[PDB]
């Protein structure tokens, strides 16, 4: 649960991402895959990537980065009223992709890392607090659907 001031910060920060959604999305996924290599195993179409250079050079990875952040941004722009948007993602990730909620924690922190990396000194304490809360909300609502489905 976020305040309007906090949502304001979230969507302010998101404007940064939208100026270069492919660049951000790429770096988020790279941070995830290199930080937590077991995550790479969940992607049949990325499991071939051994090195970060190959990751950096992958246009399909950038493409998927765009799809992921486009989806996330759509959800964030709802300011918490995202049930319709989130349910199919929760379902596909639990039932088709089999993604444990732990990996959603991983990518949440990765987004935080990337924002600091791409905007050093431009991602303030208040901004981090708001973004972190937004991602926690996202995660928590997914976790509820996972419980429903009995998915671990």
Sites of contact with ligand HEM (CB under 6 A): 39, 42-45, 67-68, 71-72, 89, 92-93, 97, 99, 103-104, 107
CB nearer to ligand HEM: pick between 48 and 97: 97
Nearest one of 36, 39, 150, 37 to 95, comparing CA atoms: 150
Was 64 annotated as part of a binding site? yes
CB nearer to ligand HEM: pick between 64 and 119: 64
CB nearer to ligand HEM: pick between 92 and 117: 92
Beta strands in 40-95 (DSSP E): none
Was 93 annotated as part of a binding site? yes
CB of 69 to ligand HEM, least distance (A): 7
CA 123 to chain CA centroid, Å, is 17
Q: Under DSSP, is residue 106 helix (H, G, I), strand (E, B) or coil?
A: helix
Tokens of 19: 């100026």
């Amino acid at each position: 649960g976020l305040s309007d001031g906090e949502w304001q910060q979230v969507l302010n920060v998101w404007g940064k991402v939208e100026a270069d959604i492919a660049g951000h999305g790429q770096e988020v996924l790279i941070r995830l895959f290199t930080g937590h290599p077991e995550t790479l195993e969940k992607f049949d179409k990325f499991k071939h990537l051994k090195t970060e250079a190959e990751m950096k050079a992958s246009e399909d990875l950038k493409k998927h980065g765009t799809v992921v952040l486009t989806a996330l941004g759509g959800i964030l722009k709802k300011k918490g009223h995202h049930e319709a948007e989130l349910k199919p993602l929760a379902q596909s990730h639990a039932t088709k992709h089999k993604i444990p909620i732990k990996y959603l924690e991983f990518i949440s922190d990765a987004i935080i890392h990337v924002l600091h990396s791409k905007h050093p000194g431009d991602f303030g304490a208040d901004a981090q607090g708001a973004m972190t809360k937004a991602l926690e909300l996202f995660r928590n609502d997914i976790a509820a659907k996972y419980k429903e489905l009995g998915f671990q």
